[PDB]
């Protein structure tokens, strides 16, 4: 019969792979796009909510669904054996589907082969760093992971040193980092790797490709692995088609689905041995932080408050 996917990810990132699942399985997939307030919509629909699988971005949003009571635990050897333990919740409460690594954009010819996140605070980078608002979720997640690894005192000192090094105010978006490296305003900056997948895959004759051509990616590590946030999913608490919900979620970590899933937004697949987009592969080997990503949610509010303490966006 059917399965209903409630997703905050644009249906066009996933429709082809959902259509393949439906064709092959004979299960009709109902795609329900929920731009924001997913927790609130599912809770309000109550015990008879049609939702089977909940899909969103950011570990914090996923944990909010779990803590908000709109998921259920599942047991699946398929999911547990595919998704690394640090990227899934205990007792099958939530599961990562792709990785969103926060990396260093670097002027294409700068002599810089490797980096630790801490290096961004080195005094020698003064006037040479671009970044978006410190309060943006991409940044608060990185700060939260830094507290988890290195503690609040070290994290505050890093924030103050990075602030001091900014070439311009912490504002704009991640792609603006590439724009401003091209423009000579900065030499390096922190921004997510998938945007470089977008820019470098853009056709020549676009500003996007000009920005992509100006930079290379260096993936920093904790001084160690690279910081990742995730997209992910969970089975809804009152799923009316529970068996099909588990079938769909297991499909979403299958090799064919993962190949398409990650390529769609140039993200990194969670499943090992999946063919990467050529640009993404060019970034070189990814070492993923062993930190449980749930730690990012644990330290998120502390991180945001530290960013505000230091006046990072001033």
Domains of the chain: 1-97+225-274 (3.40.190.10), 98-224+275-314 (3.40.190.10)
Nearest to 280 by CA among 142, 103, 111: 103
**d(C-alpha 227, C-alpha 229), whole Å:** 7
Strand-pairing partners, residue 54, are: 6, 234
Quote the CA–CA distance of 70 and 88 in Å, as a whole number. Answer: 17
If one counts every other C-beta atom within 10 angstroms of the C-beta of residue 24, the result is 10
What does R_g of the chain's alpha carbons equal in angstroms?
A: 20
Resolution of the experimental structure, in angstroms: 1.4
Gap between the Cα atoms of 166 and 189, Å rounded: 9
Is 138 among the annotated ligand-binding positions?
A: yes
Residue where the block lists tokens 């595919």: 82
Answer yes or no: are the C-beta atoms of 5 and 32 closer than 8 Å: yes
Q: Any binding-site annotation on 6? A: no
Contact partners, residue 175, CB within 8 Å, separation at least 6: 191, 195, 198, 199, 208, 211
Q: Distance (Å, rounded) from C-alpha 61 to C-alpha 53? A: 14
How far, in Å, are 53, 208, 250 from residue 69 at the CA level? 14, 41, 22
Q: What is the 3-class SS of the chain, one letter each residue?
A: CEEEEEECCCHHHCHHHHHHHHHHHCCEEEEEECCCCHHHHHHHHHHHCCCCEEEEECHHHHHHHHHCCCEECCCCHHHHHHCCHHHECHHHCCEEEEEEEEEEEEECCCCCCCCEHHHHHCHHHCCCEECCCCCCHHHHHHHHHHHHHHCHHHHHHHHHHHHHHECCCCCCCCHHHHHHHHCCCCCEEEEEHHHHHHHHHCCCCCHHHHHHHCEEEECCECCCCECEEEEEEEEECCCCCHHHHHHHHHHHCCHHHHHHHHHHCCCEECCCCCCCCHHHHHCCCCCECCCCCHHHHHCHHHHHHHHHHCCCCC
Question: Is 268 marked as a binding-site residue?
Answer: no
Q: List the structure tokens of 258.
A: 């993962």
User: Residue 46, exposed/middle/buried by CB under 10 A (0-12, 13-18, 19+)?
Assistant: exposed
């Amino acid at each position: 019969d059917e399965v209903s996917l409630y997703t905050t990810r644009e249906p066009k990132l996933i429709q082809p792979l959902l259509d393949a699942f439906a064709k092959d399985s004979g299960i009709k997939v109902n795609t329900v796009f929920v731009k924001d307030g997913l927790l609130e919509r599912v809770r309000a629909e109550g015990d008879k909510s049609p939702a089977d699988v909940l899909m969103t971005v950011d570990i914090g949003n996923l944990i909010d669904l779990v803590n908000g009571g709109v998921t259920q635990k599942i047991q699946s050897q398929t999911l547990d054996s595919v998704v690394p333990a640090n990227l899934r919740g205990a007792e099958g409460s939530w599961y990562a589907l792709s990785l969103r690594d926060r990396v260093l954009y670097v002027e294409k010819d700068l002599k810089l082969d490797s980096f630790r996140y801490g290096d961004l605070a080195d005094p020698k980078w003064k006037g040479k760093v671009c970044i978006r608002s410190g309060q943006h979720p991409y940044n608060t997640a990185l700060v939260a992971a830094m507290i988890a690894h290195d503690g609040a005192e070290a994290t505050e000192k890093w924030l103050r040193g990075v602030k001091a090094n900014l070439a311009r105010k912490a504002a704009g978006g991640d792609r603006d980092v590439a724009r401003d490296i091209l423009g000579g305003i900065c030499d390096i900056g922190l921004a997510n790797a998938y945007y470089v997948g977008h820019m470098k895959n853009a056709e020549p004759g676009t500003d996007a490709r000009k920005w992509g051509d100006a930079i290379k990616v260096v993936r920093p590590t904790f001084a160690g692995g690279t910081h990742v946030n995730i997209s992910g999913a969970a089975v809804a608490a009152h799923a009316p088609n529970k068996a099909n919900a588990v079938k769909l979620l297991e499909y979403l970590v299958s090799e064919p689905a993962q190949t398409l899933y990650a390529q769609a937004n140039y993200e990194y697949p969670v499943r090992a041995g999946v063919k990467l987009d050529a640009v993404v592969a060019s970034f070189g080997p990814l070492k993923v932080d062993t930190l449980p990503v749930a730690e990012i949610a644990k330290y998120r509010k502390q991180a945001s408050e530290l960013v505000d303490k230091v006046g990072f966006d001033n």
